[PDB]
Paper text:
Intriguingly, the structure reveals that COH000 binds to a cryptic pocket distinct from the active site that is completely buried in all prior SUMO E1 structures. When in complex with COH000, SUMO E1 residues essential for adenylation are either disordered or displaced from the active site and the SCCH domain undergoes a 180° rotation that is stabilized by a new network of contacts with the adenylation domains that lock the E1 in an inactive state. Previous mass spectrometry and biochemical data indicate that SUMO E1 binding to COH000 is accompanied by formation of a covalent bond between Cys30 of the Uba2 subunit of SUMO E1 and an electrophilic center within the 7-oxabicyclohept-2-ene group of COH000 via Michael addition. COH000 binds to a composite surface on SUMO E1 formed by amino acids from both the AAD and IAD at a location distinct from the active site, and ~500 Å2 from a total of ~600 Å2 solvent accessible area of COH000 are buried upon complex formation. The p-methylbenzene group of COH000 inserts into a deep pocket on the surface of SUMO E1 where it engages in an extensive network of van der Waals interactions with Lys34, Val37, Leu38, Val80, Phe83, and Tyr84 on the Uba2 AAD, and Ala78 and Phe80 on the Sae1 IAD. In contrast, analysis of the SUMO E1COH000 structure reveals a complete disordering of the g1/g2 region that exposes both Cys30 and the COH000 binding pocket to solvent. In contrast, binding of COH000 to SUMO E1 and covalent adduct formation to Cys30 results in a distortion of the structure of the N terminus of H2, including the oxyanion hole.
SUMO E1 is a modular, multi-domain ~110 kDa heterodimer comprised of SUMO-activating enzyme 1 (Sae1) and 2 (Sae2 or Uba2) subunits that harbor two catalytic activities required for activation of SUMO: adenylation and thioester bond formation. The catalytic Cys domain is split into first catalytic cysteine half-domain (FCCH) and second catalytic cysteine half-domain (SCCH) with the SCCH domain harboring the catalytic cysteine residue that forms a thioester bond with SUMO in the second step of SUMO activation. Although not involved in SUMO activation, the SUMO E1 ubiquitin fold domain (UFD) is required for recruitment of the E2 enzyme and the subsequent transfer of SUMO from the E1 catalytic cysteine to the catalytic cysteine of E226,28.
Numbering used by the authors:
A (entry chain C): 17 to 178, 205 to 346
B (entry chain D): 3 to 53, 69 to 224, 238 to 290, 313 to 332, 342 to 548
Amino acid sequence: AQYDRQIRLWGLEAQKRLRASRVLLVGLKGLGAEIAKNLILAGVKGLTMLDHEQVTPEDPGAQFLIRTGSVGRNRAEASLERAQNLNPMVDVKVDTEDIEKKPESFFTQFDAVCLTCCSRDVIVKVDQICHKNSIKFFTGDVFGYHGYTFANLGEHEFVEEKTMVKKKVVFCPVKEALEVDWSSEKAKAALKRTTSDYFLLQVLLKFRTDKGRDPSSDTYEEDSELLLQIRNDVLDSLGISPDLLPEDFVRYCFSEMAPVCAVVGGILAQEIVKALSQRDPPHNNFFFFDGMKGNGIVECLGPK
Amino acid sequence: LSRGLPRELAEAVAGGRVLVVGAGGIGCELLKNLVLTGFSHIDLIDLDTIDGRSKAQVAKESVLQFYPKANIVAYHDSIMNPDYNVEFFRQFILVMNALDNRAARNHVNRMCLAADVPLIESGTAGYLGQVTTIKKGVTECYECHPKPTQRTFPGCTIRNTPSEPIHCIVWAKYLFNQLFGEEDADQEVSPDRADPEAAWEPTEAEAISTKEWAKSTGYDPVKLFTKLFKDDIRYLLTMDKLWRKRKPPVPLDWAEVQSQLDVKSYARLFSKSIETLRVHLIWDKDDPSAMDFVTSAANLRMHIFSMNMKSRFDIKSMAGNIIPAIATTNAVIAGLIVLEGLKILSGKIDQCRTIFLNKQPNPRKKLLVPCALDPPNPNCYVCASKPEVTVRLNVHKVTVLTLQDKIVKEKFAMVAPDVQIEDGKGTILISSEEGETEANNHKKLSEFGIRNGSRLQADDFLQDYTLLINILHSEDLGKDVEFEVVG
Ligand SMILES: COC(=O)[C@H]1[C@H]2C=C[C@]([C@H](Cc3ccc(C)cc3)Nc3ccccc3)(O2)[C@H]1C(=O)OC
Ligand SMILES: [Mg+2]
Ligand SMILES: [Zn+2]
């Protein structure tokens, strides 16, 4: 049982691996603020908050890390002082350049990358860069009562208790997870067991691609009509009945709600912690939250 | 829509007055979510009382630093104070609990039932958590089914700043797991220099484990009293930011406390249980050497941090559901609490659910599992119509004082009880008005004619609660049991 003690010493080392990990966080809006707070309190070595946008007059006056009346300055700069005060042992850097213009060498300094408020093209490109450098990749967003998290940990090994063993779990790229072939006979069966939040994510990603923005409460009339059109185009492109996503979805997917940010940000940050520490199994590979029904569903989409 | 919410719901949130009971636990995350969601009129109260100052007032000061335009009303008196009557609770459209003290949660449950105000209850236990809604006549209340006491605390409190008294019993139970059990990072007992409140700066020479220092030492009891009760305590004093408003601890010396519940004997018991355990692992609350190790190690730490120690029977009664906390679990639960509150403010109480937070997905891929709220338990002794219980005791040995303090106040969670006998004459046993029935406290129940089958009507007018108590006389039980509730 010599291999038994090799796992035990590697299990207690999980906290040291967490305290030595550096994380990149892109997007410091409602969801990113919660993720940053949870990671900084968790004790990671460093956290880099990257956001190219500035605080707009349409942003809510009450914000977590951004002091009231900061309209005009960078969102990551305004979030620095409050984020750093959460834990002095964590060095919190601030980056203002566009994530899409960063070189590949910029990401190598990080052990994990978490994207929020990014387009589909940026999500895929960064996940491909991270897989190219063996960097753990995460993404998430919130919209109305709904939220989601995605993880791509490649070939991930961890320690789990029975009474303690080591396992391996294989993740797939986000590109394959976002374009699933539903024409197989086995896929059509899993299609009945797949939560509609996955297709809600597809509709909103397509909205963010075309409009260059997320649905807004101010323009709820025009946005909800376009969302109803996009869900017909996207679900027809995948060979699926458009009625798999009910028509009333436009009423519960607008703006970012603070309670939804806390739920999704809590689940996402804990998945990053257990991945950096390589302790406990991670969710493979999607998590979908429905704030209206109280549902938190883990789906494995991509493989096969 | 307004920030994803309908116009009518955002108005109810802006004009709605809510009550948060408890500044600790999930309260910090809950206050953030309430303010960020748009709740302007928030009342905060806890269990402490002043003559800084109270926890609610201290928490209000930190809230206004994050958002100065918040309208926080902080109370410096305990929620158990009789001033917070039903009329007080009727001011709010929603009450959210952040306490873990069972007696206070039972009280708030009864106050919200009497005020017909929805009460959101919750709990945490590591990765696990749950949220539910309590509404009179619709759902089951907090006491429809008994539930264990939540003893889930962050590692920063157990290791660095343990506010008495359960935090030391947890530290003693963590100490048992590190030395004689499955060593875990969530149950470390060493000084937590990663605590963000500590702001630990390394020294010049700084440029280790608790079980390893006992492994090479051969589990020396006198060496384990050292390092753990004097060197770790003197290392806590090097973190100066921890001792600015709270009193700092004082180390214990073995060569002094032994040369001069009992104080100096618990140090002797600490060295006796280590020698027995090293000859023999899973912690068992019915084990002789295991409970003696926890009782001695906890009481030694309770004296280091300046507080009255506790007996062995009280340590055994506690230390049941000791689960280390996970900070993200509080953030998830606090978010669900406000989500359930939005449904209540929307007039859609039927859409409320009991939500379970699991560690891993269930057989149906659900990590967060909702379920329909259960109807009121017809056998609940609190929220049912004309509730009754049966108590088995010796009417010739039980005094009125024992009935008042241990049965009606402790077991049945009444704050200010009035107890009379259903004998036609309305004989008064116990009065909530001080200066009336103190002369009865020493008398046996049989001196008032209470015999087998006697019925006592216990009224708690603050809680708007009436309980009928059937007396079953029994001379068995044993010379250690004074009473027991049937069923
Ligand atoms: C000293 O701590 C406390 O008393 C608690 C209590 C008082 C303040 C506090 C805060 C409440 C809050 C209200 C509004 C906004 C916009 C943010 C936060 N929540 C919190 C939670 C997690 C990380 C940081 C802050 O809730 C919390 C704090 O400031 O933590 C250091
Ligand atoms: Mg009261
Ligand atoms: Zn009940």
